[PDB]
Structure 1
Amino acid sequence: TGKKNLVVNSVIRRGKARADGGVGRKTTGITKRVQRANLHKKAIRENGQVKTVWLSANALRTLSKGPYKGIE
């Protein structure tokens, strides 16, 4: 989970073969199709007073700059 917005939870991952032919080979057969999840990280921050909490790149970046309710 991040500061601004939650995260994690992701989606499936395919894997095709015969991949790419004359502008188009015969086609792209699939052989995978499963399922996955994507995470991030943290750095200590705080508002009101001292904290720590997780901080998502795409937030520690947005916070590194203009702060929004939260201070780096």
Structure 2
Amino acid sequence: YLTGKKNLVVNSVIRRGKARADGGVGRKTTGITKRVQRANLHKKAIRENGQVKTVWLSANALRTLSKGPYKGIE
């Protein structure tokens, strides 16, 4: 379960294939080409302390842990 930093997980968004830089700056408006989905996550870490452990953490979670222990020391 890719849930990070005992906190948060992956999300999903459609990604849209914009056919033009035209409209809104002087042309027939932008057309459309893509209706397809994607994911998005983040990556591994180490050294949990409820007593001792090592688990997934996120980028900004490693930041928050660097600026002080936060519910679970590090």
- TM class by shorter chain equals 0.7 to 0.9
How much has 1:58 moved relative to structure 2?
A: 1.3
1:45–1:71: 8 Å Cα contact kept in structure 2? no
How much has 1:22 moved relative to structure 2?
A: 7.1
How much has 1:24 moved relative to structure 2?
A: 3.0
Give the alignment's TM-score, normalised by structure 2: 0.82
Distance 1:23 1:70, change over 3 A: same
Percent of aligned pairs with the same residue? Answer: 100
Give the alignment's TM-score, normalised by structure 1: 0.84
> Structure 2 stretches of 5 or more lacking a match?
none
Q: Return the alpha-carbon distance in structure 2 between the equivalents of residues 61 and 53 of structure 1.
A: 15
How much has 1:19 moved relative to structure 2?
A: 2.0
Other-structure match for 2:71: 69
CA RMSD of aligned residues (A): 1.7
SS in 2 for 1:48: coil
How much has 1:20 moved relative to structure 2?
A: 2.3
How much has 1:21 moved relative to structure 2?
A: 5.0
How much has 1:26 moved relative to structure 2?
A: 0.1
How much has 1:10 moved relative to structure 2?
A: 1.3
> Structure 1 stretches of 5 or more lacking a match?
none
| Paired residues, number | 72
